[PDB]
Design a protein around this ligand. Structure first.
Ligand SMILES: CCCCCCCCCCCCCC(=O)OC[C@H](COP(=O)([O-])O)OC(=O)CCCCCCCCCCCCC
Ligand SMILES: [Mg+2]
Ligand SMILES: [Mg+2]
Lengths: 384, 381
């Protein structure tokens, strides 16, 4: 199962591009799941149908679902209630929790959205959510809360390690920790399935496996989108390009989405080397004709690109000159801050409100001497 | 301190409206803070200035900050390292945590955004974050992650009280709770009484902030739409309903356009409606022209007047619960009863809202009828 998502400013065509992509992949023979996690009614208009928590099959290959956190939070509570019935740790307090009454709090949308995607795509383990034919989906297209939140998920796998290690330290090297951690570890074990020091090691390995997949381009694919007629939309795309790099990933292409009744202009100059394409999806009052849209010659390019991408570098090291070349589109030198908290072993990059640790090879290891921003790449010279 | 935010679909003029409002309030003499929590460069083009974590003063009354979770997390960690040194709860382990190395994970943007806004507005407690004159801001304008996430923030105070009840139970009615809760309640204290006092005061502090988030003199939300995009207008009606479901209210609706050229004032009755014309050119924006434009007099007046509160109505005679539910269809509104006939749970817009029914109205749902945009629920005894 592969994962596809669209990144861009509000009004840049993300939702339009997500539905277009889902229709294209389904028409092409791929079992496709379009996942919506928001309250924007645009998708329902584009699809010509109301979508809900239960899958809606547009055709035999296009399944659409709306995630609802009110419903998603119920399953974890049910599992926790099952564990407490075996361990009686809460003296029945958990059993009295009416999950059907609980409201959605800040942060819950992002966290539960991330949990459902794991079941659908299978980043950290094999996917468990199957399509209506009992098999796993071929493509998962995700139209999420926001570009910035989607980016927290893309780069999630790499950055969990340090959190888990600090948490293990607080569990195994503190009074209250050695007191609580035992039972908590026993409860999370029961709740998940149907010794403590050892439970922490397996967890760390399970985290490492998730970074191999989320990094694997044969699992995740990101596309930039922009309204070609809005200068702010184009500029935001370039910014989100660098935010994607800073998340630890890459962009697979850039699209100019025109939902108006005009031919889609292409501002292809600023986004090379990315493959560029445009799409014309007019918002007709009588309902979209997807047969016509998908067959329009103007969309032939984007359709090919989409299929070639699912069909199948940010750092370049120079061992001789002691250099780390960091591609940083959408950023200015002033916005990129370099830190070193682990000696010459690693280099931390701070930009776009995200931190990225770049472990340095033996030859490059050292302290930062200077840096220069040429074009859109920062050349960092190391000193030994 | 007052709070202002704009709700609408992507590309509907939210950020444009927020910068317009910030300029208007500062010009009216109010100490204004424009808070941006996202990586969208649009605000900088609109303001004509780079924005960062440190405040940028467009004028003596207009401060602009971009929040950054990487930085927002460091200071709270510092406060937690102090309490650990005193109470010795972690035995120096917390002191070894390198906040400056940690990456932002899913959910942290929302949590830390919510914390910073509390310091700036002071809904639960008195505002802590002061302007450059050492005084609380008069107006906080928030342009956040997304409309949906901002609605989770608007509803927090009304929906935590249930979570807090269950957490107090786990702390006072379980063996692990009775053993650890006392120590944990102390550590929280210093970081910022008796444990039962703490819980009792928390529950008061929670309802104190829910009253502030319901106060029209402290919180104002506005719908924005592009009047030439039907999806933008429909989205505004939907987020109106989501605001009601969050436990709050909308104070007005704005049609933002980049030109002076079919406003849907009638579709948003009884909200005060106004249009706004914010022309822009690549060279930048002429805010003196935009703010003196007579086409923008109405939006400026509506912003200045503010600086439906009742969405649930009870009829003790006919035994009815009338729910203002704009933007929803009868099929998108679910009504559940988990406490017998004493309560009514409304599920809509991926949010739940609990209505405690007056003793007279109490009973079981026996019919619902959508009238205009109000759901009339007949309660059967
Ligand atoms: C200001 C508002 C703050 C809100 C902060 C964000 C809260 C969201 C936390 C939700 C995480 C719940 C745990 C979870 O979903 O894991 C699911 C896990 C996987 O099961 P499976 O399907 O793979 O067999 O199966 C399980 O059931 C794991 C159960 C063990 C972990 C329980 C953690 C409970 C967290 C709830 C916290 C609520 C805070 C208000
Ligand atoms: Mg769109
Ligand atoms: Mg805008």
């Amino acid at each position: 199962t592969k994962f596809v998502t669209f990144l861009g400013k509000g009004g840049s065509g993300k939702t339009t591009a997500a539905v277009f992509a889902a229709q294209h992949y389904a028409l092409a023979g791929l079992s496709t799941c379009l996942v919506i996690h928001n309250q924007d009614p645009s998708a329902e208009f584009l699809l010509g149908s109301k979508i809900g928590t239960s899958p809606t099959l547009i055709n035999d290959n296009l399944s659409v679902i709306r995630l609802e956190t009110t419903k998603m939070l119920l399953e974890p509570l049910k599992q926790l209630k099952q564990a407490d019935a075996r361990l009686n740790m809460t003296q029945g307090v958990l059993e009295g929790v009416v999950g059907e009454e609980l409201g959605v709090l800040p942060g819950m949308d992002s966290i539960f959205s991330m949990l459902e995607l794991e079941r659908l795509v299978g980043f950290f383990r094999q996917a468990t959510r199957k399509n209506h034919k009992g098999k796993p989906f071929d493509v998962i297209i995700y139209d999420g809360i926001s570009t910035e939140e989607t980016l927290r998920m893309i780069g999630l796998s790499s950055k969990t390690r340090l959190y888990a290690k600090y948490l293990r330290s607080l569990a195994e090297k503190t009074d209250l920790g050695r007191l609580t951690s035992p039972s908590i570890m026993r409860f999370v074990d029961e709740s998940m399935n149907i010794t403590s020091p050892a439970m922490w090691d397996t967890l760390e390995r399970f985290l490492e496996t998730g970074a191999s997949a989320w990094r694997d381009p044969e699992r995740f694919r990101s596309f930039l989108v922009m309204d070609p007629n809005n200068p702010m939309s184009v500029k935001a795309a370039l910014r989100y390009w660098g935010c994607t790099v800073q998340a630890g990933s890459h962009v697979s292409g850039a699209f100019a989405i025109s939902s108006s009744h005009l031919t889609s202009q292409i501002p292809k100059a600023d986004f090379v080397p990315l493959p560029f394409a445009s799409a014309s999806v007019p918002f007709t009052i009588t309902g979209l004709d997807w047969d016509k849209i998908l067959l329009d010659q103007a969309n032939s390019s984007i359709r090919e690109l989409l299929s070639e991408t699912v069909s199948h570098q940010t750092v370049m090291f120079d061992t001789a000159k002691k250099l780390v070349t960091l591609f940083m589109p959408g950023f200015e030198k002033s916005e990129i801050k370099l830190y070193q908290y682990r000696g010459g072993s690693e280099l931390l990059i701070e930009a776009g409100d995200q931190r990225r640790v770049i472990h340095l090879p033996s030859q490059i290891q050292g302290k930062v001497g200077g840096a220069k921003f040429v074009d859109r790449s920062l050349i960092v010279t190391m000193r030994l």
